[PDB]
């Protein structure tokens, strides 16, 4: 296993690390667009 | 900014206001009011007053310059 | 319309809007707004007249 011993050694380090880095970017985008619409309500109040 | 909008609205009613009388209602938030100075007018009104106090007539308060219902 | 009120600007005496609900200070008594009055069938025995 030229690649198989190393896919668990020097690639399993990276792809397990980018997993939680993918989760939080997924998590904040749901959090961000929620913050977007809450600001769009208050701007719709004050401008009116 | 929503509180400063509330503040500048809610101090339009603390002025030595003039007194008029409600005459007619046109539509949503715009009416005809006759003053105690005579010379019947046509102004816009506020967004605060509950509209169940103006049925044929009411002793009302008016602005000096813009002459709105207060 | 002749004998109709309009909105006149105090700026330059320009016309602003045709004002409906013509001059009539005595239709308080006429055209009653609410009718939650009695019904049609409790008259009871005047069917030739009705």
Curated annotation (Swiss-Prot), chain B:
Compartments where found: Cytoplasm; Nucleus
Transmembrane segments: none
Family: Belongs to the AAA ATPase family.
Function (record text): Component of the 26S proteasome, a multiprotein complex involved in the ATP-dependent degradation of ubiquitinated proteins. This complex plays a key role in the maintenance of protein homeostasis by removing misfolded or damaged proteins, which could impair cellular functions, and by removing proteins whose functions are no longer required. Therefore, the proteasome participates in numerous cellular processes, including cell cycle progression, apoptosis, or DNA damage repair.
Oligomer status and interactors: Component of the 19S proteasome regulatory particle complex. The 26S proteasome consists of a 20S core particle (CP) and two 19S regulatory subunits (RP). The regulatory particle is made of a lid composed of 9 subunits, a base containing 6 ATPases including PSMC4 and few additional components. Interacts with NR1I3. Interacts with PAAF1. Interacts with TRIM5. Interacts with ZFAND1.
Protein name per its UniProtKB record: 26S proteasome regulatory subunit 6B
Native source species: Homo sapiens
From Swiss-Prot, chain C:
Name of this chain's protein: 26S proteasome regulatory subunit 8
Intracellular or extracellular location(s): Cytoplasm; Nucleus
Quaternary structure (record): Component of the 19S proteasome regulatory particle complex. The 26S proteasome consists of a 20S core particle (CP) and two 19S regulatory subunits (RP). The regulatory particle is made of a lid composed of 9 subunits, a base containing 6 ATPases including PSMC5 and few additional components. Component of a complex with USP49 and RUVBL1. Interacts with PRPF19. Interacts with TRIM5. Interacts with NDC80. Interacts with PAAF1. Interacts, in vitro, with the thyroid hormone receptor (in a thyroid hormone T3-dependent manner) and with retinoid X receptor (RXR). Interacts with ERCC6.
Species, as recorded: Homo sapiens (Human)
Modified residues (Phosphoserine): 12
Chain's role: Component of the 26S proteasome, a multiprotein complex involved in the ATP-dependent degradation of ubiquitinated proteins. This complex plays a key role in the maintenance of protein homeostasis by removing misfolded or damaged proteins, which could impair cellular functions, and by removing proteins whose functions are no longer required. Therefore, the proteasome participates in numerous cellular processes, including cell cycle progression, apoptosis, or DNA damage repair.
Lineage, uppermost ranks: Eukaryota, Metazoa, Chordata, Craniata, Vertebrata
Family to which the UniProt record says this protein belongs: Belongs to the AAA ATPase family.
Top-level division of the source organism's lineage: Eukaryota
């Amino acid at each position: 296993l030229e690649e198989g011993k190393a896919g668990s050694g020097l690639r399993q380090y990276y792809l397990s690390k980018i997993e939680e880095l993918q989760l939080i970017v997924n998590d904040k985008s749901q959090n961000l667009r929620r913050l977007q619409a809450q600001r769009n309500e208050l701007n719709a109040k004050v401008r009116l | 900014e929503f509180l400063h909008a509330q503040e500048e609205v809610k101090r339009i009613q603390s002025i030595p206001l003039v007194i008029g009388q409600f005459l007619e209602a046109v539509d949503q938030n715009t009416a005809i009011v006759g003053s105690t100075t005579g010379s019947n007018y046509y102004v816009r009104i506020l967004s605060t007053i509950d509209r169940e106090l103006l049925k044929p007539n009411a002793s009302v308060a008016l602005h000096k310059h813009s002459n709105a219902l207060v | 319309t002749p004998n109709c009120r309009v909105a006149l600007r105090n700026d330059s005496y320009t016309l602003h809007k045709i004002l409906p609900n013509k001059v009539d200070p005595l239709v308080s008594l006429m055209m009653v707004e609410k009718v939650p009055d009695s019904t049609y069938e409790m008259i009871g025995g005047l069917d030739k007249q009705i």
